[PDB]
């Protein structure tokens, strides 16, 4: 009759911590096979039936939203890693769940959780100091211009792909796209467009914002394509003759009235056309299509009009020119108008593409993909987003370490030899922390279809001989040096990966009970 719980579900002690460790392995299992450039994809359907295919771990975790209390802890730390950096959320998730798996059999033996926290704090501090000593700063080294070093790092992620034959041309396209930007670099700045048909080497890079230009309507042989300082107009208005936005419907019995009805119908449209000409806007773009009648008035008044432009391309242009998108034509004025240096309409792709070159406020550019099908461009597109960040990070941070689990192996050897020198219960816990770092080089072998046993056994035995930079090659199956292969990652990013992994692992251990208030 009278109880303390009355619907309250709570458990404490060892079974509470063990239940949380099993829940954290479910989160890591989903992003487990997505690690590596060659990792397999996933398919997530929403409640409305929309399919989503992405290999990025940060995107998958946002669509999951697991309601388990301990699962929300790793997801929140993963989102914090994606906002500050944008890569490594999979590495943080795997290391966080692997730390709990190694200490799982020790908790069932009666070991107190606070002692385990003491090991994760001590071993992490030794790993941070070891990385800073082994890190090497390579900038002007070997008297090579950064343009060539960034080129070899660009074709690294582009190697052994469908474009692997023409990748020598695409390697310079990634370098040229980054160099056009200012000291402020971000991935969402550079755009990528897909055009079906044509050879691979025909892919064009434009310093301005380009769009497909689906507009086929009237105004041919007019609207000059070369301007000096045109006023860029951004309007969502629909100028079509027959349209639902601008029209007039009036019925009467007097024939004389229909004369004023058809005239006032065009006069309402002319008032919106004259307002655009009054503001002095030269280049006039619109998201909604524009009819043939409005194009004739612009040709008579010497005005450029290009319609059917996507809104995303307008916003990338709005930031490029420095103008603003205004829905109504009455608010169009010099405040929302943009400017550009050189405008030209090219033949690229067989279809006219308009682009704004030399905008003072433009930090963005546009790269066009050319391939035989969509799968050629889609597989290449995912590789280009990673290729740009490789060029972006190498300039920002000069001190870098090798990827492919190369840095994970050196830390496992140093911490294993040091753990033997500390008498206490810390010897078994630090030793387990060293074997927990083996998950990074192991998952790269399984996702690549290789044999994880033969590679790790041959790789671990090689580090005993003193080789520091050796790691796993995702293309050929063998041990290889990732430093001479130019597989690099920033040192500060990898250091924050261990700190975020250990800090998230201590939170799950530090919780011995889950209190749920019944509602």
């Amino acid at each position: 009759v009278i109880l303390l719980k009355e619907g309250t579900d709570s458990s404490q002690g060892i079974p509470q911590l063990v239940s949380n460790i099993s829940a954290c392995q479910v989160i890591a299992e989903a992003v487990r096979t997505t690690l590596g450039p060659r990792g397999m994809d996933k398919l997530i359907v929403d409640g409305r039936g929309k399919a989503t295919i992405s290999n990025d771990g940060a995107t998958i975790l946002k669509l999951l939203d697991v309601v388990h209390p301990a699962a929300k802890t790793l997801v929140d730390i993963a989102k914090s890693q994606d906002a500050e950096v944008g890569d490594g959320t999979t590495s943080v998730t795997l290391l966080a769940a692997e730390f709990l798996k190694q200490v799982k059999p020790y908790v069932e033996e009666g070991l107190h959780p606070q002692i385990i926290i003491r090991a994760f704090r001590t071993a992490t501090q030794l790993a941070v100091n070891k990385i800073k000593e082994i890190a090497v700063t390579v900038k002007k080294a070997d008297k090579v211009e950064q343009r060539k070093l960034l080129e070899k790092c660009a074709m690294t992620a582009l190697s052994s792909k469908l474009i692997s034959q023409q990748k020598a041309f695409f390697a310079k396209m990634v370098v040229d796209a980054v160099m056009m930007l200012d000291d402020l670099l971000q991935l969402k700045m550079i755009g990528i467009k897909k055009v079906q048909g044509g050879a691979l080497e025909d892919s064009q890079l434009v310093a301005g914002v380009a769009f497909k230009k689906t507009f086929s309507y009237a105004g041919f042989e007019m609207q000059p394509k070369k301007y000096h300082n045109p006023k860029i107009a951004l309007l969502n208005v629909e100028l079509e003759l027959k349209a639902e936005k601008d029209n007039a419907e009036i019925r009467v019995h007097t024939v004389e009235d229909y004369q004023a009805i058809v005239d006032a119908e065009w006069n309402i449209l002319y008032d919106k056309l004259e307002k655009i000409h009054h503001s002095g806007a030269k280049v006039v773009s619109s998201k909604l299509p524009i009819g043939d009648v409005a194009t004739q008035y612009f040709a008579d008044r010497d005005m450029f009009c290009a319609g059917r432009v996507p809104e995303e391309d307008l916003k990338r242009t709005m930031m490029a020119c420095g103008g603003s998108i205004q829905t109504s034509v009455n608010a169009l004025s010099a405040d929302v108008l943009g400017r550009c240096q050189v405008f030209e309409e090219t033949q690229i792709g067989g279809e006219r593409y308009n682009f704004f070159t030399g905008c003072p406020k433009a930090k963005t550019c546009t790269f066009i993909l050319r391939g035989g099908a969509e799968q050629f461009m889609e597989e290449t597109e995912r590789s280009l987003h990673d290729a740009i960040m490789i060029v972006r990070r190498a300039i920002k941070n000069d001190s870098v370490v090798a990827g492919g689990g190369a840095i994970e192996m050196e830390l496992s050897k140093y911490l294993r030899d040091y753990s033997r020198t500390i008498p206490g219960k810390q010897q078994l816990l630090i030793g387990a922390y060293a074997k927990a770092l083996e998950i990074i080089p192991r998952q790269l072998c399984d996702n690549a279809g290789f044999d994880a046993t033969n590679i790790l056994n041959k790789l671990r035995a090689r580090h005993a001989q003193g080789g520091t930079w050796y790691g796993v090659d995702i293309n050929n199956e063998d041990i290889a040096d990732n430093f001479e292969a130019f597989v690099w990652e920033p040192a500060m990013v990898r250091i924050n990966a261990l700190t975020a992994a250990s800090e998230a692992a201590c939170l799950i251990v530090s919780v011995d009970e889950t209190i749920k208030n019944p509602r």
Binding site: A30, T33, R38, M40, D41, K42, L43, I44, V45, D46, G47, A51, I53, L63, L64, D65, V66, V67, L162, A218, L241, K242, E249, R251, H253, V255, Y258, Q259, I261, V262, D263, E265, W266, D292, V293, Q296, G372, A373, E374, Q375, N447, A448, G449
Partner: protein, 520 residues
């Protein structure tokens, strides 16, 4: 959110489940492949009954809620603008690649490693097609062989009777919008239409914009030699709106007044024609019996009751402009056309508006007649294939011999290159050679012959008997060697057939998991 009842599966069980759902689509269209393929009955959501073997129609009408099956439908959508022939053959080939891949999964081969073997073996098959290919129109422009080749593929459809007439129409249409020297053909400029009644031999090719509309008066000139085109949204008469009339009389004073506007506006709007200099008048609403009078003596043609969307179609081809109000009239907005004629079909009067440039224009539309709607609809997709074949014949003169001779010859080249690939992808190249053998094998089953017995003999003939490739006879003609039977398919259609099939197999094998929320 909605974690309960969420589908969760992985490992080899999820891959075999995706292959099983994909083989259900391939086994469905495998029987309809070829001219002897069995038809599929279709019950529309409204209760209609349609029966056709067209592969592009089957995947469109089939609604499957399975995610992997929806990806197979998205493949045929892009192929219709490229091949249009082996659309059924790709799905059969895609199902053959996944069926052989199921055997390799039990051996422990990783799916990504399997997807690599197909891409490596695909480049060998594509390279082999260029060696065994042959040209036709190389270094010459001739319409005679272009008609004979496209006529063979059209014989399997409902156009079989008029098959000779349909081939000549597609030749002059593609040559009109595109020159054979540039070898660049735009399929969007070539339209297609249809109307019930008549026969299939009544199909006429017109260079220009064409809609079905008649003249305001029957005695108007049947052919217009001068080029003047007035495109307006209003007829020449007392003004009327563009939507609805709804005549409601008030008193007798207003009725007698309208009669004063009659005689005033009848002569005023017709004299505006001679003042501007127009001849053919195009307007949304037609003319009454009074307006046709004055147009008889001056020999001024006109078109009555023009549809709303059909107004913009004439201004694009003829180059004219739309004039919504009478104050905007002028000579610079007048259209241009070579000749405007009225062609009546048979005794029944269609009275279609025919606008021609008396030359080769950039816009052509094929207007197909026929006795049944299900025959005309099938005649539309049949001619759509001939438009795509001739498009590929002009863009690429090199062609290969169909009937299975191409898929069998590639199976021999890939099988020999397998021993040169010392790695685990060797097994993927062997399964790719056997999967190409399904297309020629499916043609033997639909023709009422032993699939295996016929297939094994043909493979021996391409080696022992003669080096050149030989095909399988589906129609039970005289003998093999389809080169004599004049069965030929385009080379680009073969390159995109195995390429689009390999791309989707690689896409399916890379998805090991599907996540959808459950209803709770």
């Amino acid at each position: 959110k909605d974690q309960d009842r969420k589908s969760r599966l992985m490992g080899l069980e999820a891959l075999k489940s995706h292959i099983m759902a994909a083989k259900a689509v391939a086994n469905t269209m495998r029987t309809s492949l070829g001219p002897n393929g069995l038809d599929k009955m279709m019950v529309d959501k409204d209760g209609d009954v349609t029966v056709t073997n067209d592969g592009a129609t089957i995947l469109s009408m089939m609604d499957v809620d399975h995610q992997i099956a929806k990806l197979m439908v998205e493949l045929s959508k892009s192929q219709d603008d490229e091949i249009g022939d082996g659309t059924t053959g790709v799905v059969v080939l895609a199902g053959a690649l996944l069926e052989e891949a199921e055997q390799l999964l039990d051996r422990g081969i990783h799916p990504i490693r399997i997807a690599d073997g197909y891409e490596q073996a695909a480049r060998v098959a594509i390279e082999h097609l260029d060696k065994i290919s042959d040209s036709v129109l190389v270094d010459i422009k001739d319409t005679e062989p272009l008609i004979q080749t496209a006529k063979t593929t059209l014989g399997s459809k409902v156009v079989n009777s008029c098959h000779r007439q349909m081939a000549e129409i597609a030749v002059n249409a593609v040559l009109t919008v595109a020159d054979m020297e540039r070898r660049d053909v735009d399929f969007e400029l070539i339209k297609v239409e249809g109307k019930v009644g008549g026969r299939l031999e009544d199909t006429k090719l017109i260079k220009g914009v064409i809609v079905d509309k008649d003249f305001s008066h029957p005695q108007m000139p049947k052919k217009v030699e001068d080029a003047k085109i007035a495109i307006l949204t209003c007829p020449f008469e007392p003004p009327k709106p563009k939507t609805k009339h709804k005549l409601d009389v008030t008193s007798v004073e207003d009725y007698k007044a309208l009669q004063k506007y009659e005689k005033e506006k009848f002569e005023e709007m017709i004299q505006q024609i001679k003042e501007t200099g127009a001849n053919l008048a195009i307007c949304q609403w037609g003319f009454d019996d009074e307006a046709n009078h004055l147009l008889l003596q001056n020999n001024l043609p006109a078109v009555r009751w023009v549809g709303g969307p059909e107004i913009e179609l004439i201004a694009i081809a003829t180059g004219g402009r739309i004039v919504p109000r009478f104050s905007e009239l002028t000579a610079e907005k007048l259209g241009f056309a070579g000749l405007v004629q009225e062609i009546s079909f048979g005794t029944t009067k269609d009275k279609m508006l025919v606008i021609e440039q008396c030359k080769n224009s950039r816009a052509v539309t094929i207007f197909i007649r026929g006795g049944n709607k299900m025959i005309i609809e099938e005649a539309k997709r049949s001619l759509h294939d001939a438009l795509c074949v001739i498009r590929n014949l002009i863009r690429d003169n090199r062609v290969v011999y169909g009937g299975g001779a191409a898929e069998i010859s590639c199976a021999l080249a890939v099988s020999q290159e397998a021993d040169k690939c010392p790695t685990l992808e060797q097994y993927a190249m062997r399964a790719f050679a056997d999967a190409l053998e399904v297309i020629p094998m499916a043609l033997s089953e639909n023709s009422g012959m032993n699939p295996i017995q016929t297939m094994t003999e043909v493979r021996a003939r391409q080696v022992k008997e003669m080096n050149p490739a030989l095909g399988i006879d589906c129609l039970h003609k005289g003998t093999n060697d389809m080169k004599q039977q004049h069965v030929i398919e385009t080379l680009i259609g073969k390159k995109q057939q195995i390429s689009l099939a390999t791309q989707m197999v690689r896409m399916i094998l890379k998805i090991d998991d599907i996540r959808k929320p459950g209803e709770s």
